[PDB]
Amino acid sequence: NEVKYLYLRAVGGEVGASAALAPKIGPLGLSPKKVGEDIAKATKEFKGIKVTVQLKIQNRQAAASVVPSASSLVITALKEPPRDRKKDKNVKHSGNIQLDEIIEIARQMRDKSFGRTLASVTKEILGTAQSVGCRVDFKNPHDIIEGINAGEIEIPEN
Amino acid sequence: MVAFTVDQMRSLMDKVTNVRNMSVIAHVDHGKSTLTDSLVQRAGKSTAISLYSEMSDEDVKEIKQKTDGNSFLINLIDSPGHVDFSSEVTAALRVTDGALVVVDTIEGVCVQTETVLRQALGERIKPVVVINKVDRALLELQVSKEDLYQTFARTVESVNVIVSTYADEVLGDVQVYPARGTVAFGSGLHGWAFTIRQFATRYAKKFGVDKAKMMDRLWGDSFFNPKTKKWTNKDTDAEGKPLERAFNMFILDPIFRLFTAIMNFKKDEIPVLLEKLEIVLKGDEKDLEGKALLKVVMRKFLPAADALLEMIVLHLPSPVTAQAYRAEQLYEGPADDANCIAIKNCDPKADLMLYVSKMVPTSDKGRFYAFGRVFAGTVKSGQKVRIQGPNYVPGKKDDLFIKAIQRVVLMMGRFVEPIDDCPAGNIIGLVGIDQFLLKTGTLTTSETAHNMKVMKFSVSPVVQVAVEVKNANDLPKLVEGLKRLSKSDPCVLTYMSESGEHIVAGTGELHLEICLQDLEHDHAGVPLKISPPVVAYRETVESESSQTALSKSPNKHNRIYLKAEPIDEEVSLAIENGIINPRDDFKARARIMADDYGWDVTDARKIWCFGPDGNGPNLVIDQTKAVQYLHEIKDSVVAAFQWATKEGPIFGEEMRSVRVNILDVTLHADAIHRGGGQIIPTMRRATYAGFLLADPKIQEPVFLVEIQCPEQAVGGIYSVLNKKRGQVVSEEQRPGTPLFTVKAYLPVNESFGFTGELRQATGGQAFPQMVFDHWSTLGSDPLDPTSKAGEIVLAARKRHGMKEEVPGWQEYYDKL
Amino acid sequence: IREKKAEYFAKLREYLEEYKSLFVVGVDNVSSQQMHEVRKELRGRAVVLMGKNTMVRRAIRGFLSDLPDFEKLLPFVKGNVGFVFTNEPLTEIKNVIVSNRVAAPARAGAVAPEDIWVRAVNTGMEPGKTSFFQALGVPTKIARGTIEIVSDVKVVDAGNKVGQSEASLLNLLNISPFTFGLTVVQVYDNGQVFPSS
RNA sequence: UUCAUCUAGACAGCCGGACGGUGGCCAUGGAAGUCGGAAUCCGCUAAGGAGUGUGUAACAACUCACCGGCCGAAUGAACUA
């Protein structure tokens, strides 16, 4: 009924675990169950990945929407063809993400990000992707980052 | 009451609006029995005691209940504070309507105070709080005047946190406040207590100030501001030298001056204060020192027995008004049946509704009067009554008896009072039952009277100890003692373990030790010894019988070739709950077994028997090709499988999830050489041989344990579980309450003393319940005596008297 | 280290000779997130440079060779200070710097500059927080299933530092009593220093 | 003895900051720097570890690496006997 704002990380396209949201939402009155499917409605595209979800709860109504986050956007941009949950430990996902995607990812974060130019944000996401373990343009993200440094992979400052 | 009149209690009880059915609940040592003794002081296990209190017009009108008259009868239960007895307090809560919360001023709100209020507020009981041992803060902690007030405020605030969290959203306003008169303060040991509402009356007789407005001014941020006579609501700095509040300066101050003068031996000042407070003396109290003059003056100045019962009469509900919102809670039936409505009315002329909760011993072995609460109708001594069992369903034949009562009786202080009849909504016991009601149930008259709820309690029997007598010939006296203990104490559980062991189950170590003490001395009368119960294991395989098992008959004319299979657990679970049943028809039970469980269809039809006992979770498969005389030895083969699956070859325990695939059989032509005496031994040895090559392993039972614990103490759950190999499954939180619920798999092997370990690690706030769930296969070899699974086998064999080593596959196998 | 040290000299030299105006800002009790926010606001318009008080003095003292006028900067370079360089309408530059003030959360050990109070209000926190209030002695009631303080309590008295118990309750209720932001001690431009006012 | 830091302010001490992407990849019932395996990135930077410890069920909240404010001339470490 107010500006109350929650931030839960849930695997996409699935209702959050009871222990994940039911303790927090419900002290105000909203039953967890229909909130649970609310994230599912937001997360359809981000299904199979633990994405952040903002909750703008007001008048027993939770505005569920995926919060753009480096790890989430990078992996879902590659679209991560169906990842077998029972495959093995240390689920690996590297694929090959294009420069076009990562700079487009940086735009979605450029608002919140603290970079000066777009080049700063783009190398930032590449640093994120290295942790995620991807392969930007068949090359290590660090190598592209230093490539951006010595005027090799330019960034449209728009 | 010293034998006022047998009819007079009956006549007063007839009034259903002037009666108070309450139980006193508190922490273990917060003085609840002393307060109860002080309540019975002026009246001349938990047996109900009844109290009589008169009243006047002015304070009887100030009662938010439908009532008429000026005398009241109070029904009191002495509930136990120990968590190990947290089941009979639930029994008290079902049989009562009000709760007197005794609270320590020194210790405050403790763990068991937290628990009992949760029980009371779950059962929709209005609590009233009394803060006892206030004398301790005055003489031990030396709180002057303001620290005592602050402790009271902390105590009231702490109680209301419990109330606000656990009060159902049907009443809401059941919060406890001293201003409304719902909180009392006093010292039960010295026999003095008060309420600010009572104190507001004392000053009105001299000041003439209104009493309705003294409630919100004698408590809280409210100051008299003397030298000006203006009741300020804040300190205001008092134009300098900030002044004290009304609670300290009007209520606590007269108490403290009496304490200071009397304890400091101001013989000139004691009479001055006493004559000011209009007290009464005796012929020997003038010659009195401290610690005894203080007790007599305080009981006379502010009598606890007078404040407390008036506290009950005002705020604690009557039966006629609580059953209105409680009837749907005790009645699992619909809300729109005549029997449900008769509960709400509390009318003594409808069909009978008497919930028996206790079996009160009679000083005679096996008479056990049936204590309970009448809900609807009037019971008469010598009337046909339909007894219902806990699992009674009116639709079909169930635990319904058509017996009658011999005598309706009133409970009092360890004496029994027979009366002809009793109206609805009070406390009554019955003579002539305990041969027709094991633990609990209801006593009714209607044909559409469903039994009410089972009276769920927050605890469960989690401490398991095996019991058996040193004297072998004294076995029946123990089992007679066990059955007598099972009916005396309502929470103790006696049963037989799967290893033929007598098990006594209790809530905790203290409760179990109480019951075991009863066995040794009171109930059985025979000295018995107590040990941890023997865990019953199962024997399984985790491979495919690396080479074929070959066994020869004693005459060598018959040979059995077979192999072992690790049957899938889902199929094993299916068999034991009746999905795959031997009495079903083959080629149809096979189809469910094959299509719905992934097995081979041909094997599914070719079923010979289940083991053990003919319906166990073990299988024997006819994998044989065409062969002459299988069908004549089929009976012998299944009998040996029953033998082999009942006593396994590792340490003699039942087989589980073991499939025997009989690859080939070679039988003599003449039946006299392939009889039972030749096939039964050879199949069992072949099965024993087949088992020992398919990586034999042992299965331990695993408890499914669920614990309710508050947030502060959840850490102890994981610490104990991770030390006792527990496997945490899931967590949840109840809506609004901070109570966690942890579901985990705690192995039965490492499950003795777990509750004692859990209670110490969580500070007693954790409440575990356990039930057998499944069998888990240990990964270590049970034939390696130095393995974690091979020490169980070695230990078990020694206890059974078998040898230390396990006979290898070299035995049971014939070289061919 | 010296090569790294000389690089800051080069950066300071370049700024000193390319930005007519520079803002001497006191950054006491200023968080790093706050500093990031200020730089974002001033981005494009201006550049913020911090450094070691002694380092800049030696840098400025040496730079006097080409740019003598900068001598007047030195005496005011003391305490936790930084340099915001701009070529912009200073008033707007000054406003943004001194308006980014962010209320720092109450912290245990910070000397209280006034009398912190917990006024009677509907805190909105669920009843499992009464311990925090009970710890400080604050009288509370549960109205509408939430903590309601009954009476004014002075949680911290002026002067005496915020205790751990004091701070914990205060951070729950968001009663942060001290705000910090980049304050300006001097303004240099057109080769002249003068106060912000 | 060797290697380092130091008037471009060293060590100690007191006080301020110790961020953003980001809840980095994961499995884990839960793990958000701090049960763990692998990876040790980028931006803002005077500076901040995909975190040295306390702590949590996990968050939270403290703390230290790192940089600053004060002071002002020396100091630290590892070795040798």
Ligand SMILES: CO[C@H]1[C@@H](O)[C@H](O)[C@H](OC[C@@]23C[C@@H]4[C@H](C)CC[C@H]4[C@@]4(C=O)C[C@@H]2C[C@H](C(C)C)[C@@]34C(=O)O)O[C@@H]1C
């Ligand atoms: C109310 O309490 C109930 C259950 O809830 C509880 O699980 C308890 O468990 C008892 C055991 C039940 C297991 C299954 C029947 C197979 C093996 C049995 C056990 C081991 O031998 C495991 C638990 C613990 C008991 C051994 C160690 C003595 C069991 C037994 O009765 O033998 O049973 C009582 C009757």
Ligand SMILES: Nc1nc2c(ncn2[C@@H]2O[C@H](COP(=O)(O)OP(=O)(O)O)[C@@H](O)[C@H]2O)c(=O)[nH]1
């Ligand atoms: N000083 C003081 N001691 C008390 C009071 N009430 C109980 N006690 C102590 O508690 C002990 C037994 O109390 P009891 O009523 O049996 O505790 P219960 O288990 O709650 O019934 C006695 O030894 C008393 O010293 C009280 O009001 N004041």
Ligand SMILES: [Mg+2]
């Ligand atoms: Mg007692």
Ligand SMILES: [Mg+2]
């Ligand atoms: Mg952790």
